[PDB]
């Protein structure tokens, strides 16, 4: 059964290598979440540093692709960094060729096309990663676009990824049923981050210290990650309410 080793069709029209790349996605055992505000897009991800000998500042699955675009990865770090370097290069080339910053959705499509090629071409394996791209697009506003090893991609009102993704997904669904809107009706990004952490706490059922989380924020004209003390400041605000 060599149809399970390379990306050719099985008798039932399936690509097993693509399906097994999806299972590599959860190898890190980390859950990520993304939501949109009025002015911003917030992405949060768990940060697990098991080894005491590790330098915790170098352990990260959130990447600054361009000034405006951020990307969080669910999957092993080697493939994650491979995807990040390619995205950075593509975004840079786009700006040089076409004279404006690459939109989040266009980068998502491009990376999705690259992933599609690996599902069709035999010599290249799929990357075992799911890429969530976030920005505040100058035309479309707050944006979340997500890519997988099948080459699929779509925009999101909000999204979650990881082993316990379904619990987070329904938690978010139930909120948007209640609020009756496509986003978090909030002025500052600080409170949108607080919303994101609050609803992750409810869905996962765990408490977080400052070193258990990782936060990326996209505003108009810049995407940035938060420090431990920025997150701690955010955790204190949630606790005092």
């Amino acid at each position: 059964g060599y149809d399970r080793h390379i990306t050719i069709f099985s008798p039932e029209g399936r690509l097993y290598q693509v399906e097994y790349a999806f299972k590599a996605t959860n190898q890190t055992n980390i859950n990520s979440l993304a939501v949109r505000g009025k002015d911003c897009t917030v992405v949060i991800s768990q940060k697990k540093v098991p080894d005491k000998l590790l330098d915790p500042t170098t352990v990260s699955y959130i990447f600054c692709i361009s000034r405006t675009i951020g990307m969080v990865v669910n999957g092993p770090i080697p493939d994650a960094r491979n995807a990040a370097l390619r995205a950075k290069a593509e975004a840079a080339e786009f700006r040089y060729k076409y004279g404006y910053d690459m939109p989040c959705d266009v980068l998502a499509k491009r990376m999705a096309n690259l992933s599609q090629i690996y599902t069709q071409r035999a010599y290249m394996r799929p990357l075992g990663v799911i890429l969530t791209f976030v920005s505040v697009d100058e035309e479309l506003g707050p944006s979340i676009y997500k890519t997988d090893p099948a080459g699929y991609y779509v925009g999101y009102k909000a999204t979650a990824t990881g082993p316990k993704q379904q619990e987070i997904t329904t938690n978010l669904e139930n909120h948007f049923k209640k609020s009756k809107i496509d986003h978090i009706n909030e002025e500052s990004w600080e409170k949108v981050v607080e919303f994101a952490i609050t609803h992750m706490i409810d869905a996962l059922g765990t408490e977080f210290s400052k070193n258990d989380l990782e936060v990326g924020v996209a505003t108009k004209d810049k995407f940035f990650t938060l420090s431990a003390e920025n997150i701690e400041e955010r955790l204190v605000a949630i606790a005092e309410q």
């Binding site: 097994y20 959860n26 005491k52 000998l53 330098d55 092993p76 770090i77 394996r125």
Partner: protein
């Protein structure tokens, strides 16, 4: 099955068994360590003396990249040399285009992407080495450890090879007992002790100690080998601790 016969093939778990098999080659190799200190890094390695006929001090294993980065590795020694040769090419082209010597995090990703590339195709074999490396740049000291999968992180202390667990335990004590920081000269002494302690896991053949270091104050930010009086002083410190 047969999923483990070819590199770059995902198993039903989502694993690349060929990379995990390369890790077994690394675990079979001699012990090597890295200690991050106040203003730099220290590297040390175990050299098994197979025979009396080996010339002492003349089979050097630690390798320099550029003038500010040191690299040591465990596993298939030739594979490590191939990786360092690439590292030297990467560092040269960086300095060529950008003038400044390659930063350690930048250098770390160059090796990482290269090793990761050797997990993408069935026409190549994964690297049979884990590489501990680092140095001093504009932002201070950095220590890294890179594995066959292409995975790397920054480290306060790092260890790999046959005596990695013994060395890791000893490294964790130093991190706990010295929260403010360890000095360069202290880290050299500690490196000797840890290699001697990690040698208990490879104690048939006796061994030869080899240490190197990069420090902003002690070596002026450049990679140097520890030799002569400073080496013998570090050996004596280690000898006193095992007894």
């Amino acid at each position: 099955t047969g999923y483990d016969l070819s590199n770059s093939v995902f198993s039903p778990d989502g694993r690349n068994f060929q990379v995990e098999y390369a890790v077994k080659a690394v675990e079979n190799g001699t012990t090597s360590i890295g200690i991050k200190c106040n203003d730099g890094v220290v590297f040390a390695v175990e050299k098994l003396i197979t025979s009396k006929l080996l010339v002492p001090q003349k089979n050097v294993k630690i390798q320099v990249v550029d003038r500010h980065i040191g690299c040591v590795y465990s596993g298939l020694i030739p594979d490590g040399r191939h990786l360092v040769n690439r590292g030297r090419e990467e560092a040269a082209s960086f300095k060529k285009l950008y003038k400044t010597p390659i930063p350690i995090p930048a250098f770390a990703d160059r090796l990482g992407q290269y090793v990761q590339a050797h997990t993408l195709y069935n026409s190549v074999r994964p690297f049979g080495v884990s590489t501990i490396f680092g140095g001093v740049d504009k932002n201070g000291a950095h220590l890294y450890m890179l594995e066959p999968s292409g995975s790397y992180w920054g480290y306060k202390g790092a260890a790999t090879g046959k005596g990695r667990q013994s060395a890791k335990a000893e490294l964790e004590k130093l991190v706990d007992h010295h929260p403010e920081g360890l000095s360069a000269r202290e880290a050299v002494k500690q490196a000797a002790k840890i290699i001697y302690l990690a040698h208990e896991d490879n104690k048939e053949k006796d061994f030869e100690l080899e240490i190197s270091w990069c420090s902003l104050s002690e070596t002026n930010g450049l990679h140097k080998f520890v030799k002569g009086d400073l080496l013998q002083e570090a050996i004596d410190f280690a000898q006193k601790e095992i007894n």
